[PDB]
């Protein structure tokens, strides 16, 4: 819900932050399963991917993405 | 045992083939390692593999996907020559046997020139002279005779020196058969063919001598639709005889497909299996290129499972089998979006098949017919080669012969499927997940501890516990089998440094302290039992720690606050039995704390216990 | 975890190092950060035996998990199916000992088509840039720091010699048909070299033209139709005898 509409503070190139927090959020989710969600989650991380390129720390986004993408195989 | 002689005899082929593979030596040839269980069964079956073999030994595209090498004009053609040259061969073997009483017995006198061996063999199938003959004898012998069954043992050199002695009586033929040995692929040119194929039409078409006959329309490929029953009367002669006279680009004339086609589609196998004799028609298919008819017909004969499952592998091991891509069809069909004339194999189910008869009692023999399914997936993703591993351990419960003991001292002694893949991590946790979710607790955790995952062991050893930690360990009990594993698992996890998160781990160590507090409790070591929970720091004891006991007690896990009960009366009973035998005083103010806490706690039977905690306080006083 | 079962499966270096470890190093000095990495990677591929750094121990945990079983095809091709699909989210930070053990043991399991995929994915991510691409077209300059660029796409394409090398190795014999449809041995073939002619990767295309020359394989490359290869001949032709005559 933070991601979509954009709110301030959470506008501009600080929602690379954002993202980093569904990637951390996300990946504490899978492992947590695989320990032991559905469309809209895959959904949330392509959509979160389009953030990383519309922002597009040349390097540190670059990671980042790779980090999302991995998630999104995780849940598929 | 569920594998009969033949079938343990190619399991073992099998396995060399997959040790090769998985020691990433050379490919091998897989026709030669299954005919060499051949022939230790009758000829029926070496017979079947040599045909394989010289049906399958074509320059392939390696790297080349197989609908492209069978759609190919290119590979068609050489089909039809190698098919060729094996009935040729063959019925040559067949006119040394009718000379000879035995192979051996024609082999040590030497086998002779298909010249002499034809007329030898003409001697006997042809006893006296027919009157219908034409164009004179050679050698005691009618020269068309001569030439057919030296070109039906494939030999045209023998032939064309039979024409040599007739050049007078045969007249043209000569330098029309002459070109017939010189051109490739048994063909004439078409001027040529047109000069001959007139004549043959023009006045011979009904001819005396029914060895003219054939000769003429085999070098010519015409008059398709008369078989030549005079001469062809076996099956591999009509065969031959086609094969012969196949065309490649309107009247008069066959075509591969069509004749691929018309044999099946008009003759099926009610035709060609009414001498109940199942390899006669495997034959017409194989040596058709209809391989994958051939296969499923084959496979459906009970008694032929084995020979079909592996001639469906060499078509597999050469990129030539055309597998079915939905794993929902039928054992044979034709593709929707595919030519009409080809047909496809479900190759999934086939091997499928023939594993469940022999996977619940020969495991490690299924795995290796399980490995030509490492290629594909299902429609969930899953590598079908891991999931039958999967489905067959679930089934067959051969866990350390599969997937490898760990025993109760550190070591992991690898199983049968180490061999395959080296990553074991998930069907190990996939085969742990089922037995999961049939509340087989006592397995699930030692099959994830197999595969260290200690997020889960210790997840269930929670479970498992928090029943018997109040219980009565005695010999051979449900607690002390439980308690014993969940030690060997907490050394273990020491020693080696593994820990799930801090939640999990932190109850499993504490239900192993209080399983220690019950064990001293029960065997009356009242002084070594109050220590141990003095030190968990779970019960207050002194007025002070209420607050905080109280407040840790609502985050802990629920494993914990079912037993609490248990303890708070246990460990009264201990103060309890201390204060009959200052520090009467301390004793009292203790039991005084155990109540307080028990009141602002709520728990299970805190009814029962709450009253029992205040009269043993008040027996104090 | 089981400790000494590390320790005895470790090099000498390694073991040596763990020997003389202090905590003032561990906690403040590189070579115990360093030392510490070795370690949890080797439990890590063994229970296997930053979501980066954690897919990859996951991916190894399926992909050891698929070697551990009897064969089911639903089992061992999910497992292998999820172990090629962690293993490509993470592929631009994979390490060449990590991918090399990874396709062996794809191999062993005849999960060639997969091996092969994962190679080219992780060359492509090494180098999204193409900085290979432009080395080769620019004669390949020596003192030109692209080279590395060029160097780990070059791991990947020796890796994928291999699947193919064992492939053809493991099925030497096989028929490509029995009883007139493909066997499973032939299946493998053609989704493998599908999975290798289904490729966009140019720099591949190149060490596969010079892999094909280098077997022998006339039958093929001579059969590719393509120009490609011809304009890559153009260039190689006044060189070698050997490409001239081809």
Redesign the interface.
């Known amino acids: 819900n933070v991601l979509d509409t954009q709110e301030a503070p959470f506008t501009g190139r600080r929602r690379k932050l954002v993202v980093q927090w569904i ?1 951390m959020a996300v ?1 504490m989710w899978v ?1 947590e399963v ?3 969600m559905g469309s809209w989650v895959s959904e949330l991380l392509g959509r979160a991917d389009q953030v990383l390129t519309q922002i597009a720390d040349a390097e540190e986004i670059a ?1 980042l993405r ?2 999302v ?6 849940v598929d | 045992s569920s594998l009969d002689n033949i079938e343990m005899a190619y399991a073992r082929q099998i396995y060399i083939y997959n040790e090769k593979i998985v020691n990433g030596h050379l490919q091998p040839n897989l026709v030669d390692l299954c005919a060499s269980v051949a022939e230790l069964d009758d000829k029926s079956i070496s017979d079947m593999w040599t045909m394989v073999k010289q049906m399958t030994d074509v320059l392939l595209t390696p790297a080349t996907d197989a609908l492209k090498n069978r759609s190919s004009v290119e590979v068609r053609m050489e089909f039809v020559r190698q098919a060729l040259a094996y009935l040729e061969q063959s019925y040559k073997n067949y006119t040394l046997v009718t000379v000879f009483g035995n192979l051996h017995q024609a082999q040590l006198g030497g086998v002779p020139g298909t010249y002499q061996l034809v007329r030898s063999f003409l001697n006997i199938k042809l006893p006296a002279p027919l009157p219908g003959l034409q164009d004179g004898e050679v050698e005691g012998h009618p020269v068309w005779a001569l030439i057919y069954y030296c070109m039906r043992c494939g030999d045209l050199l023998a032939a064309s020196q039979v024409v040599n002695r007739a050049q007078h009586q045969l007249g043209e033929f000569k330098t029309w058969f002459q070109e017939y040995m010189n051109s490739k692929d048994r063909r004439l040119s078409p001027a040529t063919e047109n000069k001959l194929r007139l004549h043959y039409r023009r006045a011979l078409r009904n001819n005396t001598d029914p060895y003219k006959r054939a000769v003429y329309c085999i070098i010519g490929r015409c008059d398709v639709t008369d078989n030549q029953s005079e001469v062809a009367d076996k099956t591999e002669d009509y065969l031959w005889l086609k094969l012969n006279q196949v065309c490649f680009d309107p009247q008069d004339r066959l075509t591969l497909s069509q004749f691929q086609k018309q044999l099946l589609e008009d003759y099926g196998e009610s035709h060609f299996t009414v001498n109940q004799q199942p390899f006669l028609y495997f034959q017409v298919l194989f040596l058709t290129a209809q391989f994958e008819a051939a296969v499923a017909f084959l496979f459906r004969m009970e008694r032929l499972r084995c020979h079909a499952v592996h001639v469906a592998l060499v078509l597999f091991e050469l990129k030539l089998l055309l597998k079915s891509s939905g794993q929902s069809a039928q054992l044979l069909s034709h593709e929707p979006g595919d030519p009409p004339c080809l047909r496809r194999l479900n190759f999934v189910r086939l091997l499928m098949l023939y594993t469940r008869k022999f996977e619940s009692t020969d495991p490690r023999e299924a795995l290796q017919y399980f490995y030509f399914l490492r290629d594909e997936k299902d429609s969930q993703g899953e590598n079908m080669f891991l999931r039958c591993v999967s489905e067959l351990v679930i089934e067959s419960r051969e866990f350390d012969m599969i997937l490898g003991k760990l025993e109760n001292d550190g070591s992991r002694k690898p199983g049968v499927i180490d061999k395959f893949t080296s990553d074991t991590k998930p069907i190990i946790n996939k085969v742990a997940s089922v037995a999961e979710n049939k509340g087989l607790f006592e397995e699930a955790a030692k099959l994830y501890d197999l595969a260290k995952n200690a997020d889960k062991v210790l997840e269930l050893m929670n479970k498992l516990l928090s029943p018997v930690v109040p219980q009565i360990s005695a010999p051979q009990s449900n607690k002390e089998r439980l308690k014993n594993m969940a030690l060997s698992i907490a050394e273990r996890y020491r020693a080696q440094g593994i820990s799930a998160n801090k939640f999990v781990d932190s109850t499993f160590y504490l239900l192993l302290d209080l399983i220690t507090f019950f064990d001293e409790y029960h065997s009356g070591h009242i002084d070594r039992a109050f220590d141990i929970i003095e030190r968990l720091k779970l019960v207050p004891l002194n007025q002070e720690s209420v607050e905080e006991r109280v407040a840790a007690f609502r985050n802990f896990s629920d494993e914990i606050r079912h037993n609490l009960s248990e303890v708070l009366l246990a460990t009264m009973n201990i103060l309890f039995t201390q204060f009959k035998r200052d520090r009467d005083s301390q004793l009292r103010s203790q039991a005084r704390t155990l109540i307080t806490f028990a009141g602002m706690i709520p728990y299970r039977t805190s009814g029962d216990t709450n009253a029992r905690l205040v009269q043993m306080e008040v027996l104090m006083n | 975890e089981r400790v000494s079962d590390i320790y005895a499966r470790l090099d000498a270096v390694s073991q040596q190092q763990l020997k003389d470890l202090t905590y003032e190093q561990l906690f403040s000095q590189t070579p115990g950060k360093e030392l510490a990495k070795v370690l949890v990677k080797a439990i890590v591929n063994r229970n296997i035996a930053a979501p980066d750094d954690v897919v990859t121990f996951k991916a190894q945990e399926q992909l050891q998990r698929a070697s551990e079983q009897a064969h089911n095809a639903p089992v061992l091709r999910a497992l292998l199916a999820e172990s090629l699909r962690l293993f490509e989210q993470v592929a631009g930070s994979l390490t060449p000992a990590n991918l090399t053990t990874a396709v062996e043991q794809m191999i062993s399991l005849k999960y060639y088509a997969g091996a092969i995929q994962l190679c080219l994915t992780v060359a492509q991510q090494k180098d999204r840039g193409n900085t290979a691409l432009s080395w080769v077209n620019d004669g390949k300059p020596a003192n030109d720091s692209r080279k590395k660029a060029f160097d780990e796409r070059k791991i990947c394409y020796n890796l994928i010699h291999q699947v193919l090398d064992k492939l053809e190795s493991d099925f030497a014999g096989e028929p490509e048909l029995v009883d007139g449809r493909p066997t499973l041995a032939a299946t493998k073939r053609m989704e493998a070299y599908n999975v290798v002619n289904d490729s966009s990767d140019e720099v591949f295309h190149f060490d596969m033209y010079e892999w094909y020359i280098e077997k022998g394989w006339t039958d093929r490359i001579l059969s590719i139709d393509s120009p490609h290869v011809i304009t890559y001949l153009q260039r190689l032709a006044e060189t070698d005898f050997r490409h001239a005559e081809l």
Do not use: H, M, V, Y
């Not at chain 1, 993408?69 to 995780?74: M, Q, T």
């Open positions: 990637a990946d492992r695989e320990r032991r990671s790779r980090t993408k991995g998630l999104k195989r995780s």
